[PDB]
Design a protein around this ligand. Structure first.
Ligand SMILES: Nc1ncnc2c1ncn2[C@@H]1O[C@H](COP(=O)(O)OP(=O)(O)OC[C@H]2O[C@H](O)[C@H](O)[C@@H]2O)[C@@H](O)[C@H]1O
Ligand SMILES: O=c1c(O[C@@H]2O[C@H](CO)[C@@H](O)[C@H](O)[C@H]2O)c(-c2ccc(O)c(O)c2)oc2cc(O)cc(O)c12
Ligand SMILES: [Zn+2]
Length: 282
């Protein structure tokens, strides 16, 4: 916990040159078009362009700590806006091109983006979510729940119960929420395409779920500025900013990135919207 293993921190960044970057995003489009069941895996790299620092990037939390410096936030969690990548993931779900979303992120931005909570696994918890110890009812607050480590927040359950409410932030030694992990695992095993975005894949078992897509011959795409633990297992590795990658991809797919209305919570995925017809591939 003090000696908690933080993994490989501050590895050099890789940038694919523009011609290679454009060709690999075309190939990502081709894979997304061909796939029956697409699962996306997100880590802290998708929120860096909203001012929230990652863990192991050059100015990540743990990288900075190793060099006796502090991370820098350009936002509060409460004032953080969903990125282009966040909003692209909202649209890809609404048109049926995303089956499921697995996130290691605690920043609350997937939920706040409007992404349906029944297609999301929050493997490490949500800064804004408290849960009733008695009835298990979750509350999605407009401000961060002021405790970490699954502690009493001081609030009681209002279900029609008075149970103690606790944060959902795992400490190092805590095991993952059984529901979120079971659904992530089932989605990842059944996917024929898993796309990782802004995760170094160093944390077990979170970082290993994408590998489960490989069994029964599924494909694995890794989008990341640094090397990741499983780069060897990728069919496609794209070294670029996830916003540049996801906006080119959406343009290839003929989709617009929708407007963010401010913080909104969707419990259940709505019926699928229309999508463009598919290109002839080959
Ligand atoms: N805009 C960007 N575009 C692409 N890659 C990016 C960008 N910004 C950052 N990266 C990359 O994004 C990657 C982010 O990797 P890590 O910092 O390990 O975050 P995790 O989500 O995997 O951390 C998992 C858990 O570990 C913690 O202990 C907590 O418990 C976390 O929940 C880096 O390789 C960056 O190069
Ligand atoms: O709780 C904080 C926080 O959430 C993170 O939850 C993690 C559990 O996956 C713990 O591993 C960390 O210890 C913790 O930094 C984060 C955090 C940092 C970078 C992110 O990309 C992020 O999504 C949150 O930063 C903090 C900085 C502080 O000075 C005080 C804090 O309480 C936090
Ligand atoms: Zn309750």
């Amino acid at each position: 916990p003090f000696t908690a293993d933080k993994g490989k921190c501050g590895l050099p960044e890789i940038f694919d040159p523009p011609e290679e970057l454009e060709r690999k995003v075309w190939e990502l489009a081709r894979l997304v078009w061909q796939s029956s069941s697409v699962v996306f895996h997100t880590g802290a790299g998708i929120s860096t362009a909203s001012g929230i620092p990652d863990f192991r990037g050059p100015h990540g939390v743990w990288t900075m700590e190793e060099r006796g410096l502090a991370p820098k936030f350009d936002t509060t969690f409460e004032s953080a806006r969903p990125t282009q990548t966040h909003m692209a993931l909202v649209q890809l779900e609404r048109v049926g091109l995303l089956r499921f979303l697995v996130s290691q992120n605690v920043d609350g931005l997937h939920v706040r983006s409007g992404f349906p909570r029944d297609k999301l696994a929050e493997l490490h918890g949500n800064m804004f979510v408290e849960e009733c110890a008695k009835c298990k009812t979750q509350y999605v607050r407009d401000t961060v729940v002021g405790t970490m480590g699954l502690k009493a927040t001081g609030r009681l359950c209002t279900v029609a119960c008075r149970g103690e409410l606790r944060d959902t932030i795992l400490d190092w030694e805590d095991s993952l929420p059984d529901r979120d992990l079971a659904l992530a695992d089932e989605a990842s095993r059944n996917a024929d395409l898993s796309i990782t975005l802004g995760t170094s894949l160093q944390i077990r078992p979170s970082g290993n779920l994408p590998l489960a897509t490989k069994r029964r011959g599924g494909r694995l795409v890794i989008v990341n500025l640094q090397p990741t633990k499983h780069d060897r297992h990728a069919d496609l590795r794209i070294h670029g900013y996830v916003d540049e990658v996801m906006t080119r991809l959406m343009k290839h797919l003929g989709l617009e990135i929708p407007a963010w209305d401010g913080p909104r919570v969707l419990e259940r995925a709505l019926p699928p919207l229309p999508r463009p017809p598919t290109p002839k591939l080959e």
